[PDB]
């Protein structure tokens, strides 16, 4: 089913975004049926967006509200940070638009236009190029006059509010995640957000939001799985990088393994500890077979994405040099070694997402998107310390979701510090970065 259990709206033009509909030629159908309520929510959201979207008479009238202090309200995402982050933060702001009956508009920035097709049937998601406040986006931060957190800090009705939700955000910026301040913010027609985190899990802890979030997602850990596949379709340019790598190197395997390598160090390596970690991970989980020194089969292909190439070479040369214990036929394959960039990094994510089993590196938003769109619950390569291969080398994700790296820890009722990862069974601390949070 090319509309994804009904997640996607039929009627888009096939040739201008090939990936949208002919993705089902390349991926096994997802196990995760999106609920009836999520569906309606999206179909209803596209009526809002057509009704209030850029270029309508309702969008023109609303723009004058930026001076003279309103049926359409808006959240504006600003393009900021690495591609992994911008995908996760953008799905976040879109869930948030859903919860607050707003229109999402997207600062195209340098490249968003080039990377992604239009996800909303009948009408562009892109912020116009003449939107008056675009010159301020670089500068908007924690100390800007209309920053919600600067205002709560310094006790201060508004046409527009800036919401600073970047990882270095403070105690007052974080009040965004409270019911009280949401009631306030609820009234403001224009919201400009800049953000580099997957902030979805803290929305489940806001009351009101949590009812609707339960109704939309009966299987709670499907938020980015459905919202990602809804929103983000690669352009023809990027899609062809996907199809041509998949076609040339991966379509003849009985099984595909993905291995997403990120190493957090200012030396590119490669590192023996990390190679060691990857083989122990893959072997100890029966993901890839062992090899024998002193000596009707299946073909596995291993897709290795990384910046240094010698993680893939090592595996490639091991499996060329030595026969597998099981007699399985292994081929290792790395697209790029970057040391058309973001078109590439994008394709590689989507490629990772077509594998049957994925290994991810701890902390990488690159992993989270790949597992995210795959509907894949990874085995996570844990974060090293002192150039030592951790032991155990990896473990299975509690679930497929991305991880909220910089969450708030406030009890809004009681007005005090709290561990927000020990309030409800579905919001747990992360496996990879224990400080962060995620839906399980
Ligand atoms: N093509 C490709 N790009 C990558 C890979 N890993 C990371 N990148 C990109 O390189 C840039 C820096 O990556 P990363 O270190 O993961 O992000 P940071 O930690 O937020 O700087 C980002 O724009 C990523 O999209 C990869 O395996 N392949």
UniProtKB/Swiss-Prot annotation:
Job description of the protein: Involved in cell wall biosynthesis. Is both necessary and sufficient for the addition of the terminal fucosyl residue on xyloglucan side chains, but is not involved in the fucosylation of other cell wall components. Associates with other xyloglucan-synthesizing enzymes to form multiprotein complexes for xyloglucan synthesis in the Golgi.
Location(s) in or outside the cell: Golgi apparatus, Golgi stack membrane; Golgi apparatus membrane
Recorded family membership: Belongs to the glycosyltransferase 37 family.
Source organism of the structure: Arabidopsis thaliana
Topology class, membrane: Single-pass type II membrane protein
GO molecular function: fucosyltransferase activity; galactoside 2-alpha-L-fucosyltransferase activity; protein homodimerization activity
Tissue distribution: Expressed in roots, stems, leaves, flowers, siliques and seedlings.
UniProt enzyme class: transferase
Membrane topology, Lumenal segments: 1-440
Keyword Glycoprotein: yes
UniProt keyword terms in alphabetical order: Cell wall biogenesis/degradation, Glycoprotein, Glycosyltransferase, Golgi apparatus, Membrane, Signal-anchor, Transferase, Transmembrane, Transmembrane helix
Positions glycosylated per UniProt: 386
GO cellular component, one term: Golgi apparatus
Subunit structure: Homodimer. Interacts with MUR3, XLT2, XXT2 and XXT5.
Any one of the GO BP annotations: cell wall organization
The protein, known as: Galactoside 2-alpha-L-fucosyltransferase
Section covered of the full-length record: 95 to 558 of 558
């Amino acid at each position: 089913d090319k509309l994804l259990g009904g997640l996607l709206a039929s009627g888009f033009d096939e040739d201008s975004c090939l990936s949208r509909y002919q993705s089902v030629h390349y991926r096994k159908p997802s196990p995760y049926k999106p609920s009836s309520y999520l569906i309606s929510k999206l179909r209803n959201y596209e009526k809002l967006h057509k009704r209030c979207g850029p270029g309508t008479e309702s969008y023109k009238k609303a723009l004058k509200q930026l001076d003279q202090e309103g049926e359409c309200k808006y959240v504006v995402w600003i393009s900021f940070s690495g591609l992994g982050n911008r995908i996760l933060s953008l799905a976040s702001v879109f869930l948030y638009a859903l919860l607050t009956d707003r229109v999402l508009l997207v600062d195209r920035g340098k490249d968003m236009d080039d990377l992604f097709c239009e996800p909303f049937l009948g009408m562009s998601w892109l912020l116009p190029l003449d939107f008056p406040m675009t010159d301020q986006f670089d500068g908007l931060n924690q100390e800007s006059s209309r920053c919600y957190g600067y205002m709560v800090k310094n006790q201060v009705t508004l046409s527009h509010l800036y919401l600073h939700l970047v990882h270095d955000y403070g105690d007052h910026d974080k009040m965004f995640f409270c019911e009280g301040d949401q009631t306030f913010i609820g009234k403001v027609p224009w919201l400009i957000v800049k953000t580099d985190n997957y902030f979805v899990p803290s929305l489940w802890l806001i009351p009101g939001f949590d009812d609707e979030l339960n109704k939309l997602f009966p299987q709670k850990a499907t938020v980015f799985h459905h919202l990602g596949r809804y929103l983000f379709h690669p352009t023809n340019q990027v899609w062809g990088l996907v199809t041509r790598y998949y076609e040339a190197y991966l379509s003849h395997a009985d099984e595909k393994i993905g291995i997403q390598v990120k190493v957090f160090d200012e030396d590119p390596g490669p590192f023996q500890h990390v190679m060691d970690q990857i083989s122990s991970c893959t072997q100890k989980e029966k993901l890839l077979p062992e090899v024998d020194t002193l000596v009707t089969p299946k073909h596995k292909a291993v897709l290795v994405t990384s910046l240094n190439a010698g993680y893939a070479e090592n595996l490639k040369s091991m499996y060329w040099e030595y026969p597998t214990s099981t007699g399985e036929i292994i081929g290792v394959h790395q697209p790029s070694q970057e040391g058309m960039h973001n078109g590439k990094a994008l394709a590689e994510m989507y490629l990772l997402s077509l594998t049957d089993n994925l290994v991810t590196s701890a902390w990488s938003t690159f992993g989270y998107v790949a597992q995210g769109l795959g509907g894949l619950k990874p085995w996570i390569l844990y974060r090293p310390e002192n150039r030592t291969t951790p032991d155990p080398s990896c473990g299975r994700a509690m679930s497929m979701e991305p991880c909220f790296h910089s969450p708030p820890f406030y009890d809004c009722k009681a007005k005090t510090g709290i561990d927000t990862g020990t309030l409800v069974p579905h919001v747990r601390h992360c496996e990879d970065i224990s400080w962060g949070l995620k839906l399980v």
